[PDB]
Design a binder for this molecule. Structure first.
Ligand SMILES: Nc1nc(NCCc2ccc(O)cc2)nc2nc(-c3ccco3)nn12
Length: 291
């Protein structure tokens, strides 16, 4: 019960923090742009974490008895929310890129409609991937609870060749490498703009000020995606240790818990990172609380 509380504590903060981020975008129309449409997808996702993921994660911890479908769901649901966030964070990455790179075509391309469409597909593909073990790629009955029900234990029910080759390497590592690659060009061309506006026979502080803020938002976005990888890589690397190195000390349960917990923490930093990196956001939250 010493660690049980921690998981619940995180669940609460995850719900409040993001429901606040969602309500703030519903009151302040100065946040209701195409960009923040994806932010909500990330928020709503990190909300279902403290609402479902954590409640599930803490359940399958001690293990239980239920069918394969029911078990795999309570075991692969967290893979969905995390996978959805992969799409969102990648979207935001491309978003800030289109804005800084092609400011004019930004409005003609990055529309509020296409935003909704993408988000929808992101979740659809999020379930297709996150629940792949349910498609048949699972270990239900691969050497108590009686016929029908299965001893719902993560390691015994969820494949490793999947969460490594498929999940991590492809559906997480590759995206992060793409996201990284994006922010590479973003901050690369951004400073080129400042260089071109340095040899100009005119002030034009409108371009500079606006750009520096488009960059400020891009940087703030980079800090968001950065925390994700920083709060998931540990758990994934562990899976690579247990998998690729069978003789290597199988990660301890206590260290395994800590690592798994860290992932549940990524659903809490976003609210605080907005109220910190975004002056527009913090002022909105302040209004809500006071009033
Ligand atoms: N190797 C491994 N073992 C387990 N075992 C379940 C142990 C456990 C489960 C829940 C909890 O709160 C504390 C401990 N869960 C695991 N979850 C993950 C994981 C999730 C996302 C990426 O890796 N890997 N993994």
């Amino acid at each position: 019960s010493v660690y049980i509380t921690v998981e619940l504590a995180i669940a609460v903060l995850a719900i409040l923090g993001n429901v606040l981020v969602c309500w703030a975008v519903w009151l302040n129309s100065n946040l209701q742009n195409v960009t923040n449409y994806f932010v909500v997808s990330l928020a709503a996702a990190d909300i279902l974490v403290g609402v479902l993921a954590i409640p599930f994660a803490i359940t399958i911890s001690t293990g239980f008895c239920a069918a394969c479908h029911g078990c795999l769901f309570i075991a692969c649901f967290v893979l969905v929310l995390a996978q959805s966030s992969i799409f969102s964070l990648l979207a935001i990455a491309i978003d800030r890129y289109i804005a800084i790179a092609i400011p004019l075509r930004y409005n003609g391309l990055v529309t509020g409609t296409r935003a909704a469409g993408i988000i929808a597909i992101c979740w659809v593909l999020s379930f297709a991937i996150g629940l792949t073990p349910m498609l048949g790629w699972n270990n239900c009955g691969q050497p108590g609870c009686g016929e029908g029900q299965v001893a719902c234990l993560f390691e015994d029910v969820v494949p490793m060749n999947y969460m490594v080759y498929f999940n991590f390497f492809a559906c997480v590592l590759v995206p992060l490498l793409l996201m990284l690659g994006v922010y590479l060009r973003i901050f690369a061309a951004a400073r080129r703009q400042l260089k071109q506006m340095e040899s100009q026979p005119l002030p034009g502080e409108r371009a500079r000020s606006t750009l520096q803020k488009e960059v400020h938002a891009a940087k703030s976005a980079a800090i968001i995606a950065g925390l994700f990888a920083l709060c998931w890589l540990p758990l994934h690397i562990i899976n690579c240790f247990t998998f690729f190195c069978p003789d290597c000390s199988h990660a301890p349960l206590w260290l395994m818990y800590l690592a798994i917990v860290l992932a549940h923490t990524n659903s809490v930093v976003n609210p605080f990172i907005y109220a910190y990196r975004i002056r527009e956001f913090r002022q909105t939250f302040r209004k809500i609380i006071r009033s």
